[PDB]
Write a protein that binds this DNA or RNA. Structure first.
Lengths: 158, 158
DNA sequence: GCCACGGGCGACCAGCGGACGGTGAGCAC
DNA sequence: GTGCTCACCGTCCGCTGGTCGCCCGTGGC
C-alpha cells in the first residue's frame, strides 16, 4: 500500500496527519546509500560487477529487506532537493522555512530547489557533474536530466 | 568489407599477408580513447550526459567519423589482452613472443592473456576493478565478465 | 458523506552492456 | 584450383537508467 504523501516541513519539524516530512525524505537517500554498501559487498564476494551508483538492484535489495517504502521513481523525483540539502544545508533549510511559511505544497518547493542549485553550479564553473562527484553523499546519485538542462540554458542567459 | 584477421606478432613486427598484427590491435584501443574524448567534449558543450567509459555511442561515432574498421564486439574480444599490455608491457611482450615462437593462432594467445592478469589481480587484493581504474588507458574500458569470473574461481582455489 | 486536489510509484521505453557462432576470407599445398 | 581452418562482427538478449501520468489517498467542508 501507497506511502503517505510528503509535506513541506522545517528542519526537525514532525509532519502532522497522514503525511511525511522532509527530514524523513532526506533520510530515505541515506538509507539507499546503506543498501548500496550491502549490494557492493555482496558483489565483491560473488566476483560480480560492483556498482558505484544506486542501481535497479539496490532498489530491488531494499524492497526484499522489508524497506518496501523505497522505490526508484520517488527517489528520482527529489534527487535535486537532496543535492541542495547536501551541498548547501543553510540554503536548503531557509528554502524549506520560506515554503512552509507560505503554506506551499511539495511540488512548488520541489521546483524552487533547482534555482539555488544553478547558483552552486555557476560558482563551480558550470560543472554540475563535478559538484555531485566531490560529495561523498551525492557521488552515488545520478545528476537529474532536468537540472543539467536548466544549468546549460541559464549559462547561455547569464 | 570484413577486415583482415589478426595474427600473433612480436612488438614492432609487421604482420605478413592478408593479416593485421597485435600492435595495430592495441592502436585501435588508443583510437577509441580519442573518439571517447570527442564524444565527452561534445556532450559538455551540449549540456548532455558525459560518458566516463567507451559506450555504444563512442563506437557508433567512430564508424561515422571515418574509422569504420572499429566495432564493439571486436574491441570486446581483446579488452583483457589490452589490459595486460597496459598493466605489464614486459609480460605482454614475452607472452606475444612465446605464442609467436610456438606458431600459435590468435585464439590460443587470447585465452593465455587471462592468466598473467589473474596473478596481477591477486597481487592487488583480488581487486581487478581497482587495477583498471588506477591506469589512465584502462580506466575507460569495462572489466570483461570472463576475467572477473576467472579471478573469482582462482581465489577459491588459491 | 462527498469532491477536488496532487503526488506516489507501477509500468513502460529506448538503448545499454554483453554474448556468440555462421559466414566467408585466408593460406598451404 | 582446392579444402579446411578460424575469427570478425551481425545480430540478438536481459536488463538498465529514465520517464510519465493513472489511480487513489487525503483534507476540507
Amino acid at each position: 500500500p501507497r506511502e503517505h504523501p510528503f509535506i513541506v516541513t522545517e528542519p526537525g519539524e514532525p509532519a502532522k496527519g497522514k503525511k511525511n516530512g522532509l527530514d524523513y525524505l532526506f533520510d530515505l537517500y541515506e538509507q539507499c546509500g546503506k543498501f548500496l554498501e550491502e549490494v557492493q559487498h555482496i558483489a565483491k564476494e560473488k566476483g560480480e560487477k560492483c556498482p558505484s551508483k544506486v542501481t535497479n538492484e539496490v532498489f530491488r535489495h531494499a524492497k526484499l529487506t522489508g524497506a518496501g517504502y523505497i522505490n526508484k521513481p520517488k527517489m528520482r523525483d527529489y534527487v535535486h532537493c537532496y543535492a541542495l540539502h547536501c551541498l548547501d544545508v543553510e540554503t536548503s533549510n531557509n528554502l524549506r522555512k520560506e515554503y512552509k511559511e507560505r503554506g506551499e505544497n511539495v511540488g512548488a518547493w520541489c521546483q524552487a530547489c533547482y534555482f539555488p542549485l544553478v547558483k552552486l553550479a555557476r560558482q563551480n564553473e558550470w560543472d554540475i557533474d563535478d559538484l555531485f562527484n566531490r560529495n561523498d553523499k551525492l557521488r552515488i546519485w545520478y545528476v537529474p536530466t532536468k537540472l543539467r538542462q536548466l544549468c546549460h540554458i541559464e549559462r547561455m542567459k547569464h
